[PDB]
Symmetry: D2
Subunit: 120 residues, 4 copies
């Protein structure tokens, strides 16, 4: 299932609980792995996916503020979970920083992360 | 107080949100487009201690397009910033991912942009 | 004739383009923002036999941000559609990738949207 | 170098010439590999990249019309070339279809392709 501990290709750790009715809740950490590296996340997933072999759509957000650091920015990941022997979450993400209006054109980075349950 | 309220976008969609002191966003979304009807749950996060220079407040939220009436097997995330003042706005870009087979994964994700106006 | 001409976007940038019968786009771009000065070469492609229903004409182009004056070690692609008529527009989304090291590759690419008006 | 024959994870083939002053020109084909699968591409690249170990920025466009088929759509790839023993082009792409104004919200797909010179 979705619930568990996931790792992406940057060594970030994504610890998530999937609620019965579609909630995602947990913590997202950089590869450093200490308290300063950890941030709250919340999101949603399709809690009744199709039964035709399709993945399970989901998304979540981290705002990059914790008790140690604030980068004045937020990332959202949008993607799908694929179960089976080597479960995976395949995502694309948007990382928006707070900017002036003049700098808004360079406010948003885009990328892609793939998560598995294999600890590096 | 700034983020909390009712917002409409350029497509006529409805975003009702409460911003909590801990950085939480919670509310409901009604889409003007696509395989959707009635309200959907949303959840997200925002920077609860934004810069006090002249920059926006970063935020994001997710809707999974399942409620008690319909299920589109998909989810949208909006990533953007809130700009306060007399004419408050939230400027976003979004990613809408559908659950797909592996063979269709290459075309799972739509991208676009929405601007919300506070009402 | 429709696409061919001079276009400005919401940031004040200048897009001069010729659309060839074979689907080619060729021209020059002047950016209002970023590490850029004077004109840059652009090249792209468009659908030279678009639908004749009420839909836009798909197109895209690239600028590498190197000319004889400056080099930002980056390139933007715009992907979008042309809508003709008395008030012609090109509505685009864009990706701006910088050359990076491997360690910085995760933050190589900006995304946004530009609307162009024909003048 | 960039000039040569590349393949992505979908088995598409990207045959490109990189001109001295920044032009990219060539053909892009689906995994089917026949005439009907092939389309013209043009783009640009940084013809004087940094010398600090950074990749080479580039982009290109395909409009999905040839003498056989027309999908009324265009893809742009934006990314970077990384040289060395296993050269790679890492990209993100935007695929826009011509739509009515009412359907413009669902006009644009986003994804990512990685290219190598290894023929599947
Ligand atoms: C007023 O002060 C500031 O404005 C300020 C202060 C400190 C730092 C800072 C300094 C060093 C490192 C980070 C950092 C780097 C990476 C990660 C990370 O990947 O966490 C998962 C977290 C923090 C720093 N913060 N940067 C962030 O919080 C943004 C992290 C974005 C990570 C992105 S999300 C998409 C992609 N997927 C990942 O797993 N990671 C990347 C930035 C800004
Ligand atoms: C009036 O008629 C129409 O509107 C019409 C007619 C036929 C078809 C059609 C039918 C079957 C297959 C294709 C097709 C599929 C894939 C590829 C391909 O990947 O080529 C590289 C090309 C064509 C078909 N066309 N589709 C396209 O040309 C779009 C291909 C988009 C491929 C994307 S670019 C990003 C990503 N990276 C790749 O390498 N491939 C994918 C679509 C529309």
């Amino acid at each position: 299932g979705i619930t568990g501990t996931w790792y992406n290709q940057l060594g970030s750790t994504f610890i998530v609980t999937a609620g019965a009715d579609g909630a995602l809740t947990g913590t997202y950490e950089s590869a450093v792995g200490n308290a300063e590296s950890r941030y709250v996340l919340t999101g949603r997933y399709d809690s009744a996916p199709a039964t035709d072999g399709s993945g399970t759509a989901l998304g979540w957000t981290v705002a990059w503020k914790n008790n140690y650091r604030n980068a004045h920015s937020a990332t959202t990941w949008s993607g799908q979970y694929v179960g089976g022997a080597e479960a995976r979450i395949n995502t694309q993400w948007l990382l928006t920083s707070g900017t002036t209006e003049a700098n808004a054109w360079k406010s948003t980075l885009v990328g892609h992360d793939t998560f598995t349950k294999v600890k590096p």
